[PDB]
Amino acid sequence: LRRELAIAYEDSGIDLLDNGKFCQGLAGADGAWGRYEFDPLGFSKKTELVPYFREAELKHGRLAMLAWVGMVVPDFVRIPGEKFSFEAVPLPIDGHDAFSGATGVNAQILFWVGILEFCCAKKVFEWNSLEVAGDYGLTKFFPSDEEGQKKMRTAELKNGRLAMLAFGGAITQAVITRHPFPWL
Amino acid sequence: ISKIAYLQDVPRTILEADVLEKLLMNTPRDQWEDPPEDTYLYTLKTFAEVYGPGKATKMGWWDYFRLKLDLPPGFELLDEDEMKVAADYDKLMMEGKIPFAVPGPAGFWYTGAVIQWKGKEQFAGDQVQTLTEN
Amino acid sequence: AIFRYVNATLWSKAGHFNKALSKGAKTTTWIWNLHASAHDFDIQQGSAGLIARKVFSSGLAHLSLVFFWLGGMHFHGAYLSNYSAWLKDPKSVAPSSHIAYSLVGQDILNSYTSQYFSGITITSGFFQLYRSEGIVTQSQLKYACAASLIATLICLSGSYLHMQLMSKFTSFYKKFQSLSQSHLIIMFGFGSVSFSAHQIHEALPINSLLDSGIWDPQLFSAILLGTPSAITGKLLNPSTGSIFLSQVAAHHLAVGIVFITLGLIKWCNLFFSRNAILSLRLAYMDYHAQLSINLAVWASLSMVAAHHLTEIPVYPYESTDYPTVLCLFVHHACLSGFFTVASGAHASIFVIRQLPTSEIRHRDPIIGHLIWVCIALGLHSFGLYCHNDTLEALGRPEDTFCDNSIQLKPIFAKQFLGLQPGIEVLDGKIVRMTQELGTADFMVHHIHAFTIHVTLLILLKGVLYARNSRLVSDKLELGFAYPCDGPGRGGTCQISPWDHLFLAVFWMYNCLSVVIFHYFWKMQSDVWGSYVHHSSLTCSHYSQGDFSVNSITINGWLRNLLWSEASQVIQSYALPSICSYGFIFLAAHFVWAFSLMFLFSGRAYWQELIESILWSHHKLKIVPHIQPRALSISQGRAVGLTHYVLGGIGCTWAFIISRMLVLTT
Amino acid sequence: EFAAGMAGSKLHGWGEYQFDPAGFATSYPELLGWFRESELKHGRVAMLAYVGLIVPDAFRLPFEEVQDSSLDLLSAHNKLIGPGLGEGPMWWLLLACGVIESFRFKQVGLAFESLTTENAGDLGLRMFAPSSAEGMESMKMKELKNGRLAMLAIGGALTQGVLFNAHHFPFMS
Amino acid sequence: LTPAQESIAGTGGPFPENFWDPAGITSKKSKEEILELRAIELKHGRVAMLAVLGWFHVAAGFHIIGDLATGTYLDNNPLVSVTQLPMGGMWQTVFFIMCLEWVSTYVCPPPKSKPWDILGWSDILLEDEDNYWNQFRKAEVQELNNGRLAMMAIVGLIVQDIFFGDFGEVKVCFSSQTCQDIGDYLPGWTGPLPPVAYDFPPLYPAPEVPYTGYQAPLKLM
Ligand code: CLA
Ligand code: KC2
Numbered sequence A: 001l002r003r004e005l006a007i008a009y010e011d012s013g014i015d016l017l018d019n020g021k022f023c024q025g026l027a028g029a030d031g032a033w034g035r036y037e038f039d040p041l042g043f044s045k046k047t048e049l050v051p052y053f054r055e056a057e058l059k060h061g062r063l064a065m066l067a068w069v070g071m072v073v074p075d076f077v078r079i080p081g082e083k084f085s086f087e088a089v090p091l092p093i094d095g096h097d098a099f100s101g102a103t104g105v106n107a108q109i110l111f112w113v114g115i116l117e118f119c120c121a122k123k124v125f126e127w128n129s130l131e132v133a134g135d136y137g138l139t140k141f142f143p144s145d146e147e148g149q150k151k152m153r154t155a156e157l158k159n160g161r162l163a164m165l166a167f168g169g170a171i172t173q174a175v176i177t178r179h180p181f182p183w184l
Numbered sequence B: 001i002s003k004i005a006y007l008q009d010v011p012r013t014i015l016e017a018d019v020l021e022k023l024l025m026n027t028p029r030d031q032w033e034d035p036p037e038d039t040y041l042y043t044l045k046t047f048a049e050v051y052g053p054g055k056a057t058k059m060g061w062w063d064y065f066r067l068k069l070d071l072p073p074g075f076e077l078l079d080e081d082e083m084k085v086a087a088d089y090d091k092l093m094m095e096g097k098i099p100f101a102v103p104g105p106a107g108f109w110y111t112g113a114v115i116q117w118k119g120k121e122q123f124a125g126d127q128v129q130t131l132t133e134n
Numbered sequence C: 001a002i003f004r005y006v007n008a009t010l011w012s013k014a015g016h017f018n019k020a021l022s023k024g025a026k027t028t029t030w031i032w033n034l035h036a037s038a039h040d041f042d043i044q045q046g047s048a049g050l051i052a053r054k055v056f057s058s059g060l061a062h063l064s065l066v067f068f069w070l071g072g073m074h075f076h077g078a079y080l081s082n083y084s085a086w087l088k089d090p091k092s093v094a095p096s097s098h099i100a101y102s103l104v105g106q107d108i109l110n111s112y113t114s115q116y117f118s119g120i121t122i123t124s125g126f127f128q129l130y131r132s133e134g135i136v137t138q139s140q141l142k143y144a145c146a147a148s149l150i151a152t153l154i155c156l157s158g159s160y161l162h163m164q165l166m167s168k169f170t171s172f173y174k175k176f177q178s179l180s181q182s183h184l185i186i187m188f189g190f191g192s193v194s195f196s197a198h199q200i201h202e203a204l205p206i207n208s209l210l211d212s213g214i215w216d217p218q219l220f221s222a223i224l225l226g227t228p229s230a231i232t233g234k235l236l237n238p239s240t241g242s243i244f245l246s247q248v249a250a251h252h253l254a255v256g257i258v259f260i261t262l263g264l265i266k267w268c269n270l271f272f273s274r275n276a277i278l279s280l281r282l283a284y285m286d287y288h289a290q291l292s293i294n295l296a297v298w299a300s301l302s303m304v305a306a307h308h309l310t311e312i313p314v315y316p317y318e319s320t321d322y323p324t325v326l327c328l329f330v331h332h333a334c335l336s337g338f339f340t341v342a343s344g345a346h347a348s349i350f351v352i353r354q355l356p357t358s359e360i361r362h363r364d365p366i367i368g369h370l371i372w373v374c375i376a377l378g379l380h381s382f383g384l385y386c387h388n389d390t391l392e393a394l395g396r397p398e399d400t401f402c403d404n405s406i407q408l409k410p411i412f413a414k415q416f417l418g419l420q421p422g423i424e425v426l427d428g429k430i431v432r433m434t435q436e437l438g439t440a441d442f443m444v445h446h447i448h449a450f451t452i453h454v455t456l457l458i459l460l461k462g463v464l465y466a467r468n469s470r471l472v473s474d475k476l477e478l479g480f481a482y483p484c485d486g487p488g489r490g491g492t493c494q495i496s497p498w499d500h501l502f503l504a505v506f507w508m509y510n511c512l513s514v515v516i517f518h519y520f521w522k523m524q525s526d527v528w529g530s531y532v533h534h535s536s537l538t539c540s541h542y543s544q545g546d547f548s549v550n551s552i553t554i555n556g557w558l559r560n561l562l563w564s565e566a567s568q569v570i571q572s573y574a575l576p577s578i579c580s581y582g583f584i585f586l587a588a589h590f591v592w593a594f595s596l597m598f599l600f601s602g603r604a605y606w607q608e609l610i611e612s613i614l615w616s617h618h619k620l621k622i623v624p625h626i627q628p629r630a631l632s633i634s635q636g637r638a639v640g641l642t643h644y645v646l647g648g649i650g651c652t653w654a655f656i657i658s659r660m661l662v663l664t665t
Numbered sequence D: 001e002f003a004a005g006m007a008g009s010k011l012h013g014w015g016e017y018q019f020d021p022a023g024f025a026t027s028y029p030e031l032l033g034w035f036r037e038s039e040l041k042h043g044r045v046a047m048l049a050y051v052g053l054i055v056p057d058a059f060r061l062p063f064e065e066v067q068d069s070s071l072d073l074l075s076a077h078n079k080l081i082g083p084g085l086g087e088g089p090m091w092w093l094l095l096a097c098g099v100i101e102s103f104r105f106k107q108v109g110l111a112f113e114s115l116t117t118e119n120a121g122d123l124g125l126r127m128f129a130p131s132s133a134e135g136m137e138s139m140k141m142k143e144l145k146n147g148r149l150a151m152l153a154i155g156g157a158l159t160q161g162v163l164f165n166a167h168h169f170p171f172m173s
Numbered sequence E: 001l002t003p004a005q006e007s008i009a010g011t012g013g014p015f016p017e018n019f020w021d022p023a024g025i026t027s028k029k030s031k032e033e034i035l036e037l038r039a040i041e042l043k044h045g046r047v048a049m050l051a052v053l054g055w056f057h058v059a060a061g062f063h064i065i066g067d068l069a070t071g072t073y074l075d076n077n078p079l080v081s082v083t084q085l086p087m088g089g090m091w092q093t094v095f096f097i098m099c100l101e102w103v104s105t106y107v108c109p110p111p112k113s114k115p116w117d118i119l120g121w122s123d124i125l126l127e128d129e130d131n132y133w134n135q136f137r138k139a140e141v142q143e144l145n146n147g148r149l150a151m152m153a154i155v156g157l158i159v160q161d162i163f164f165g166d167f168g169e170v171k172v173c174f175s176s177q178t179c180q181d182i183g184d185y186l187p188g189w190t191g192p193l194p195p196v197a198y199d200f201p202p203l204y205p206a207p208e209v210p211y212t213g214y215q216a217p218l219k220l221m
């Protein structure tokens, strides 16, 4: 089960002994029909960093899940503004260059993201453990069962990885084709 | 070795097995019992006496970071071949033989030759052998 | 990590670091020893971990000091400088980010640099550096100053923190493979690549616009646009007289790539001859060994910088800014000499504190052959000058060594640039001109070699005979810095490596003074100057090409260089620009003469005089309980050396700078 | 001992070349069969790549879509991709190669679970083969040497052909 | 091999351990004859190494003694420069080499066991030292291989010069030769970029109609 972060932080820090499980028993290594322990390069053999690896994986998955939808939506709809109009910016891939620099539109996003990351670094480093890796307490809609929680974590990880690859595919295809959503 | 308590079952996180073997090989055998204060083996002993099985199984992120910073990596310690080469060099010099070298531009080249530096009178500085005179 | 142990209680102890200073302030020798051993972290109370802590934190504190100095330079350029006038018209306006007060008539020091600005002409090339970097606005200079101050604060914080972050277990400073790999790949490779990026993205457009004549804000806020196929260095910017900044950026990109490749092949272990250097790797894992090696490396790099900053022009208008190029060369040559003698010193310290390498076991042949080569070099090189003097005085120029008479042609001094015939000019000045070598160059170069070899002799003797010698066999027990071993065995004065440095500094100063004079006179006579009109120009040089005719004699050096060219500095009192330089000339002469006091006298005379003087104080009940003492022998030597070098350097500094300032304005 | 006793180190010019500077074989023993399969695939692809870089000049396939005389190593792939998806002869080749590859799953299981070091790269073809075990080992070393040479040669040929416009056999400007 | 042949085994062939002798010249020779053959081989190899060094040095120009002696620039072709040199210098060279040979063969003759040991290394050298820092066999084999290569090279250079007047001209490009252009320095070069016949096309298409805040990619041009 998942315990409140206050209780979970009681046993937190860089563990030195190793639970003898694949990746310390973390969720996300499960095939469709059986068990799929994917680690060809043996990165999980650094058991002390395994919690950091899971935190980074979940951060990347969530960020790419947002990024893919943010590459899809703008072409269909835009913010009601003159500088966000299709005439000022034809495709999402143009947004970075359009809003970089003195305009500050992307500078504000960078600033707020940096503030959020500065505030979350304490959990990322100090209070990171096998059970609280990627857990910020936003557990609304989280099932109240062990199997349900495990399945939800697996679904998050799988969708995050799918979007992690899909964002690379979509951004590369969009840069290559200069085309609307279908090629991204 | 088995007789050393702190070297038994050192957790992989504190120090890898291969790096531990290399460190022990590099360090003189007599120092394993109680290494000097300023040595990687001393750091390993001090931290293995406090961390590991049957002891503190967790560490703060910063404490672990500092421990990994101040413990040695594998590539920092000398290799078997390097230690053999250094030992042979020192043995030659102490035996009174000189692996011949000639100074070059801001350095010296090794000609691959071993000469007899000490002459017939070992304590005589006049008799040290050189190709130029001897 | 535990910062509760850093308290100001020890600030008032004044000597806590040294155990030998426990009996605080019984004499003034205690004060002098406190100062002398303040930064000798090895002999101070504590442990090796504490030594490493102090070394690293002090390095960071000095980094912060340098950042503060750079930020001050940027601030002076931004707010107290005529950089705007210089940028619009570099030739007419001399660089000046230096202003003096009007306290006691001191406003006379400020000289006309522009219509609206009066100040002191700077010679550091900072204006040219800013122009190359693309800094063309007060806002840009202000933000550079802010960045420098922020870096100062960061480095200060880092030093303060690392004084406690590093514990006795700390060993990151012993990871030589990691240190070297990181420095080679990131600090050098990535640094050079990033600076090439900076040049390409900021400096190239701005510099191209400035060369064209465009000063438009929108433009200020297409590589290889103007550079032809001509080899870099073979064609200088006609409107700027310097290597194309796009070529410089390509250079930095290539250098960064090469450094990254070297680091990667080292990472992959492609280099194979590890054994040839394994002995040095085992021996020289010491603070003083690394300090000596680094000091020598940076000395050599400083000398190469001194030569290249002038011979190869890369900064805009620095070629025609004659005071700037001269001052840069002289400054970096002096730093080269100082850091070389430093390398000798710390080599000696490493030998004293650690086991030396096996080349010390045949030290007698090494130093003997060095002594012979020094004697032969000095004899031949200087006796050619003496022969020229004597024969010319007797009235037999046909018997002297000169181009018209017997000539010593430098056959080996061969070209490698393969430049086209002619010279490069820019607005009434000779930005670049080939230096033609003859008998004078042969003689002066062999004088250079002689002086370098004698300085090296002193340093090497100090290093090799540091542990023991035929005279005294327990020099290792005596230590590093001791005055002598006694009047015995004939007299053992200055047998220590410290005294060997004390003499090598004199010899380095002599070498560098001769080098400075050679560069100054040769450039004035054969390179710098103006021109008077396929077109052929007659070049009027500042010294009128008298180096090749007069430099062949010591009398020629005394007359045509010192006496003749000291007219500016000697007659600088009335002139607002260089009256300070004349006064500094006089004061440096005074200081140099004052150094001879300590260099010639001895401790006992001054101790006895001090006691006789103290008699009167005791008579009148003025009893100083920190009993006055004469300076120790080593301290007297150090004070004499410092004053001697400072006075000589000040005289040369004022003389050359006054000459250049007057001639160019 | 070395690798997993796989062919590829014996029968060299001087007998026992054991080429593994970066210790991948020791670092990932579990991936040795995968490494051998990948090496054989790359070699057998590079051999055919060189032969199909040469032959097209002499001959062209019967279908009326590759008959253009300007289909060099540079423009061939991009031109033959064609419009849309799943419409070009390049796509026909991709589908054929996939059909061929799918048999390896039958041979070594769905997830290459049965891929061992003694069966890595072995597709069961034993036509025109040495009868003796020593002969079979010698032919495997021939194959490995030819494949490594073909990999290096195809890399060099493609790089040179694109860099200097020499898309035909000399591959030299 | 044979007991006589073993006197030099380990210092020949492509690898040191081989004994290349297709003619079987040394099959019937005695140990003294083998040592004399090795002495001849080493003398020829050293003379050939020095000869190639000097040949390239003079073919690059850099022929100062001859220049000063003749008061004129001698032909770069070494075989022509021989004839251009004064008889004074030629006889001086012959006499100096004769004196060197006389001293080396009569005043300081090498030992009968090591006829090639001109400098008398086998009086302070310890060849049979089991230390790692004892690569004298490596040094010897390097000497022999370089000397053999230099022998072949110098014979080829002389033959080619005599036949086609080609002396293996060197393009040192610094002092005797004034290379004005990048093409001169590196063959086939005509500009800052390498002479590659491939026009690197854009990996991605660009917008035909731009937009405010575009910052189109820069061109190295
Ligand atoms: C002066 C010439 C010379 C001499 C005296 C020797 C002597 C020797 N060599 Mg040989 N060698 C030479 C040149 C010479 N070599 C050259 C240039 C090469 C390079 C191809 C070699 C390569 C070589 C190898 C690889 C080995 C030897 C070995 C030996 C030893 C045993 C074999 C033997 O009987 O050689 C006697 C050789 C001769 C009598 C030379 C005969 C030359 C004939 C007549 C042809 C000459 C024509 C030539 C091409 C010039 C034509 C010019 C014209 C067109 C103008 C022996 C000490 C072996 C050894 O040391 O084993 C331990 C060994 O393994 N040598
Ligand atoms: C550090 C040492 C080293 C270096 C730097 C080096 C460099 C190069 C280069 C690049 C400059 C090339 C292009 C090249 C090529 C080949 N090397 Mg080689 N090689 C080294 C060592 C060995 C050893 C020990 C062996 C070997 C071999 C082969 C074979 C033939 C294989 C065969 O047909 O079996 C080929 C084609 C094996 C052999 O048998 O060579 C006849 C063998 O045993 N190499 N080698």
Ligand SMILES: CC1=C(C#C/C(C)=C/C=C/C(C)=C/C=C/C=C(C)/C=C/C=C(C)/C=C/[C@@]23O[C@]2(C)C[C@@H](O)CC3(C)C)C(C)(C)C[C@H](O)C1
Binding pocket: A093, A096, A097, A164, A165, A167, A168, A169, A171, A175
């Ligand atoms: C648009 C733009 C910009 C940008 C950008 C950004 C954000 C770019 C992002 C790029 C990104 C995110 C690129 C991901 C690539 C992923 C790859 C290659 C995955 C390969 C995966 C391979 C080869 C294989 C995977 C597997 O084998 C594994 C490991 C195990 C198997 O069981 C399953 C499979 C076979 C699948 C700027 C700079 C911001 C502004 C500028 O103006 C232009």
Ligand SMILES: CC1=C(C#C/C(C)=C/C=C/C(C)=C/C=C/C=C(C)/C=C/C=C(C)/C=C/[C@@]23O[C@]2(C)C[C@@H](O)CC3(C)C)C(C)(C)C[C@H](O)C1
Binding pocket: D073, D074, D075, D076, D077, D078, D151, D152, D154, D155, D156, D158, D159, D162
């Ligand atoms: C020195 C040394 C060694 C070594 C070595 C080194 C340095 C080896 C380096 C090898 C290297 C660097 C090998 C590159 C290969 C590149 C390839 C295959 C590129 C294919 C590219 C292809 C297939 C591209 C195709 C197309 O783009 C084309 C043409 C047109 C487009 O329309 C369509 C596409 C995109 C499909 C030994 C020998 C290993 C051991 C020895 O001991 C020591």
Ligand SMILES: CC1=C(C/C=C(\C)CCC[C@H](C)CCC[C@H](C)CCCC(C)C)C(=O)c2ccccc2C1=O
Binding pocket: C597, C598, C599, C601, C602, C603, C606, C607, C629, C630, C631, C632, C633, C635, C636, C637
């Ligand atoms: C003069 C002299 C002394 C006597 C000098 C002493 C004691 C120095 C006096 C130190 C004073 C008190 C330091 C204070 C600094 C100056 C008074 C500052 C003057 C600044 C002016 C601008 C006013 C020695 O003791 C000595 C020892 C060994 C070799 C040579 C000598 C030597 O030459």
